[PDB]
Amino acid sequence: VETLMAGERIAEALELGMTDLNTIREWEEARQINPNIAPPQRNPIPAETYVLNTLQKIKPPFSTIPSLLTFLNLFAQRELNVPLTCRILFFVLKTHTMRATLEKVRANLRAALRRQKDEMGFNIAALKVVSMQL
């Protein structure tokens, strides 16, 4: 029942985040016509870390989803809490044209996963060699 309040919490976080992202997107796009501009107007003082933290605070609607996908892909690109992101993608797919965005997100996820998996493989191998050389 409190998950409804959590749902409105993440929905609002999505509106705020998407609006801020659009603000900076537009700023940079229009920064190309004249470099000398005032900086953008953001509400609290970024920018995905907010959505992430309000997503991490919860203990374990259709219209809101594309924005969430944008931030999901954004988590994937910045290597931000990958287990949570994977679980989110799996849940979004499990319930509820946008499919291509999902392909994009899963691609970025698989990529992040392979990156850190290989990284840990390397670290383990090194640890084994150096332990052996002791």
């Binding site: 910045r78 290597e79 931000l80 809490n81 990958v82 287990p83 994977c86 993608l89 799996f90 797919l93 499919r99 999902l102 392909e103 899963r106 996820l109 698989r110 996963l113 850190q116 998996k117 990284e119 840990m120 493989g121 390397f122 670290n123 383990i124 090194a126 640890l127 084994k128 150096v130 332990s131 002791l134």
Partner: protein
Amino acid sequence: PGRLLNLFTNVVTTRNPDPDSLTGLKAVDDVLAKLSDEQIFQLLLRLRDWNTNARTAPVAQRVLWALFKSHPEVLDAIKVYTERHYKRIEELVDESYLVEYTL
């Protein structure tokens, strides 16, 4: 030493990092290249301390990876948790296969 963890988190979480660099900044790369064999030690002590905890593990792993590419009883304690995490990620991958199939 906590703010150390903070900075280490910031340099690897950058909005857009310098390509062709371990951590992501050639400066701190140059730093990890040069330590005093008793600095590196304290560093990997903190790396153990952080690797123990799940949320701070990937950063410690990045630092450890950068460190492992720079040089020729504690390493055990790192190894065990690192392998645990490796298996966790493997599970995540199996799930990734399911997800990949559904669509």
